[PDB]
Every structure is written in C-alpha cells, then in structure tokens.
Design a protein around this ligand. Sequence first.
Ligand code: APB
Ligand code: APB
Lengths: 332, 329
Amino acid sequence: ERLSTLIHQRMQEAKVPALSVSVTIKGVRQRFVYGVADVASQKANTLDTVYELGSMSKAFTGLVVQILIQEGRLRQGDDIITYLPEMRLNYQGKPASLTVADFLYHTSGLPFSTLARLENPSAVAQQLRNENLLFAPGAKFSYASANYDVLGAVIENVTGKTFTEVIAERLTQPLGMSATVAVKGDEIIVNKASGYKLGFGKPVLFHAPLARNHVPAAYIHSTLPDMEIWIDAWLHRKALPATLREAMSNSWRGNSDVPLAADNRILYASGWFIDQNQGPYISHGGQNPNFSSCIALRPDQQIGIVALANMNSNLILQLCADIDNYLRIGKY
Amino acid sequence: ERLSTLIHQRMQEAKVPALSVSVTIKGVRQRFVYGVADVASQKANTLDTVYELGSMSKAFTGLVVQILIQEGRLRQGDDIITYLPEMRLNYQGKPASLTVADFLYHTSGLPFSTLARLEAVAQQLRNENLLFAPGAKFSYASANYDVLGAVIENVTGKTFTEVIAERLTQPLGMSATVAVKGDEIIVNKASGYKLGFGKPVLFHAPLARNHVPAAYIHSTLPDMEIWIDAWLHRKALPATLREAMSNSWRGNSDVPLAADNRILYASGWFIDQNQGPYISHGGQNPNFSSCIALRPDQQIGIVALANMNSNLILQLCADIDNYLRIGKY
Ligand SMILES: *[B]([O])([O])C1=[C][C]=[C]C([N])=[C]1
Ligand SMILES: *[B]([O])([O])C1=[C][C]=[C]C([N])=[C]1
C-alpha cells in the first residue's frame, strides 16, 4: 500500500545488499537508502555510496554525441570510417557501410560475442576489426552494449580529448555532478560500493579489472544525489545553455526506422527507450556482472525515478516500472 | 522487398497448409490466398474457406457487450453476480467481488487451468481460486470472454449465436460468419492442423459451446474484410454501433504495466499508442491461428487466417505493418 513497503519488499525479494532509490513527483522527492555497501566490512550504504551505472552510462554518451551534433562537429549520417578508419566490418560477402546513427540506435549488426570482448581489459576499431554483422546496417534494432563503446571512440576522435575529460567538461562539471566520473580503468574510487554476483548467494566480485574501452557503454560511476541532479536536468531543461537544451530534445528522439514486434513498438533514442503508452515514458536499465540499476522519467507529471543496487538483479530492472505504476494508479 | 515475398516467405517458414491474408492501405486492398484447406483430399484454399478465429472472436463478444452498454441494458460496473448468480469465486480466504469490467479487461484473476476446462459457465467456474484480487493485475485468460457470452445471453434472453447474427453479422452483411452453437458441420471449413513433428490433422475434437465467445467464432477472408472496413469506416453506421465501437477501443489503464509493455487491453483488442493508435489481437486454437491489426490514421487493416497453430502467424500482421510503415521487416 505504501511506496516504502513496495520498495523495501522488492529489495528483500531481489537479495541486493544495498539499494538506493530516489523518486520525484510534482516537485516532491523521497529517498530510500537501504542495506550495506560492503557485507564483509559492514559498511552501511549512504548517500555518498558510488554505483556503477552499467547501461545507464549510455545516456551520458548519447547526450555528448548530440551535443557535438548540435555544435556542428558531427552528424548522425556520417560514415563511421572517418572517425574510426581502421574499423572494417563485414556483412555476407562484402564489407558493410556504417554510420554514427547505426551505433546510436543499435542498428549496427555487431555480433553478441562483442560484449564479452569489450569487457575484456587494441583500440576499439582494431578490437572489432573483421567482425561479421548479424544483419545489414540499419535493418533491425538489436541491442549491443558495444555500440556505445564505438561512440566513445568517436567522441575522443572528434574532441581530441579523452572520454573522461569530455564527460567531465561537457556534462558533470556544468551540471554540478561532483561524484560522477567516467573511470579511466582499475584506479580506485573512494566511497564506492562493493559489487556482488548473485547465486547461489551474494559473493563479492567487484575486483575484476574494468576495460577502459567499455566505459562509455557500461562504466560511468555515480551517486544517488548526482543521479537526482541528472534527472532534474532532463526534467527542467530551461536555465541550461541553448546547446544543451537542443541536444537534450534530440536525445529523446526515437529511431522509428526499424521493424517493431507485435507486443513491442517502443523506440530507442540516444541511450534511452521511448514509450508513448501512458507516456512519454523514457527509461533504461543498467546491468553489469555485479551492479544493476534503472531510471525512468515521465515529464508530463514531472516524475523521475532512479534505483541503484550493488548486485546484478533482474528485479532491479523492473523496479522503476513498479514505482511508476504505484505513482500512476496506486497499484503495483 | 515485396509484400508478396514477405507473406509467402513467412507462410513457408510457418509450415501452415493454408494461409489467407488481406491487407488494405489508403483504400487499396491486396489479397493473398495460398495453400490447401485440406491436405489429404487436396482441397485448395479459396476465398470461401472458413477458418476458426480463436481469440479474435473476443472483439465480436466485446463489441456486443459495448452495444448492450450503449443501449443502457448493462454497465461495466455491474456486479457479475446479477447475471451469473450461481458463479462464486474465491480469493484467498473469502469469496471475491467481481464486475463485468473484470472479464472485459482480464483483471478477473481466473486460474490458468480454466482455459483447458472451458475447452452453464458459472457452475463450471464455481469454487474457483483467484490468482489475485479482482482488478489488481492484467492476466489474459480466454475464459473471461466465455463469462461475457453468458452475460450477453442472460441480458438478451437469446442465445449467443442469435445475438451475434442479429446484432453484428446480419447488419454488417457478413454472410459466412457464425458463432457455432455446438459441433455441427460448417460447409467450407478448412481442416485444422497441429504442428509436430510434422503437422498431421487435429480436426476431430468436438467444440465446447461454452467456449465459443472467446475462441469459437468462424469466418472467412472476405467477411473479415468487411469487419475491418466497418471498424475503419464508421460513418453510415447506426449511432449506437458507432458509439459502441469508440468505447470498445478504450483501453483499461487501471492495471500495472511492465517496463517493456505499456500496452492496454480494450474490449477484445490490444491498444498500442506507439507508432499508433495500433490496435491488434491474435487468435490461436489447437489447430488454427490468426492475427488482425488496424492503424486507422493511415486506413491500414491487416488480417491473416491459417489452418494450423503457429506462433509465426501471430507476428505476421506486425511484419506486414512494418513493411507498410517503413518498407522493411
Ligand atoms: B546494458 O547493456 O548494461 C543494459 C543492461 C540492462 C538493461 C538495459 N536496457 C541495458
Ligand atoms: B486467444 O486466447 O486464443 C489468443 C490466442 C493468441 C493470441 C491472443 N492474443 C489471444
């Protein structure tokens, strides 16, 4: 009956050691901070606890891409080969032509093997060289985390800077997100939560080293209060420099130019799923071997929901939807 | 690259003996009639071939319910108990209160086993244990619309078959469309097949009268074309049927939605706003499968009917819609 019941109940059901949730509706915001950030050392999860964003990193990457487009430095229809010259990929008999848009919207065709290759700690172009596409570029929407790693390399090539520096200079600094960072690699982050991989029970895993190339697709780190700032930025675009406002509108534009299933006509935007049903409802989950998270926005009602958890859990990916139901009709 | 390629490709993939498809866009309509209604006797699929509509039936039942509502004889909020006094259902410890809307929108909580059981309805479902409290969740159960058949009969005082004919099939001019009373021979009915390992006939089994409203309506390609055109073009339709039709497409928003599904259920239709309104339903009996989809903004109407049960046929309307929408699939 109570939101706090819903969230607490789902946390126990998911067996996550720490859960952090923030929910805002019509300018009223409640926080839910639960559990321990490190089971063995008994360190309680707090507002300062840092969580890997997994695939929720893609919205930061996509927004930067659209900032560059807004400023005229890049175009969606640009051939990928200009920014990643050495990257050759093949469809059937003949090397395939690919655009920046194909990675933005997951219409590239990159094989499923390319995730466990990009997570492995060669530059991305040589890392994906002589790959075989699952389909013709543009033909279908297939989700592949590696697509946004390709976009990281684009951002560096065009910028002439590192991904971390762009993220900070373009997004984190101007927005005031002081605990959010695109990690360079294995170097330690203070206040960070330990990550767990479920089954049979939650044993620690965090330690495995993080591939630099995969950061833009899966390795941005953040906190609940910074994610709150991120949400409020997307909900309240005004008071932001015209460039960012326009890049944000364009970021939420879904690619309609793909086949849609009978039960699913949702589109993918620049690191977001866009759903018109009881919408606009804009969302994305994150799943990493040892972290999981979700975010959902329903601007028409100024609704913004984010959940961050130190364990990989399919329940966490459904959690933002459950909260949204409770807000929409008092039921979940 | 060609619609004809798409449909024919999908028919080979699905291994359906007969497939009939009709597609209309911007008042241009193409028909695709393939295969044999009966494999053994080599009887070719033809415009007159009759196919079971499975769950497609539900839109006929739902529209009739909405016709009764429009006339004032019925209301969504009515207690089911008034029409089916004998049918008493329980949730947890104690008996649970059910409305007409619960069956219309599949928020009743009827257990899964009931389908195989419906294959009077109230004595049939007496003592049933609800999966959840009425209204709490959307859970599709074919039997929900069988309850609505019994409601239509009790309100009308007529049989389900007579109402469907008098209210819908006769006025709309659908000659070959009928709600089957009990097992009895239908002239032109295609034989039904069950896949696997290779599809042999499943024809013999007898049809439960109680289940007709949910999955037992029979029809033809040209009649389904008339049905589609009636939903797409409602002018020249009596005011009551027009209003019933608008109300039939109103989805029930009062249920929890999954992260990847925000689609609503209407009165025997799924209502999708994405690249929509896009209204669809699929039918799947042991030995028949079918689909239908409408995208009115573009006067688009698609129907497929097949004499074998196939998950591919359920996706076939969406493939065609993709082809129409973006020339790809
Ligand atoms: B991403 O690949 O980490 C990802 C994980 C879980 C859900 C979604 N949508 C993306
Ligand atoms: B119905 O239960 O026969 C049915 C079958 C297949 C799909 C849908 N939507 C309903």
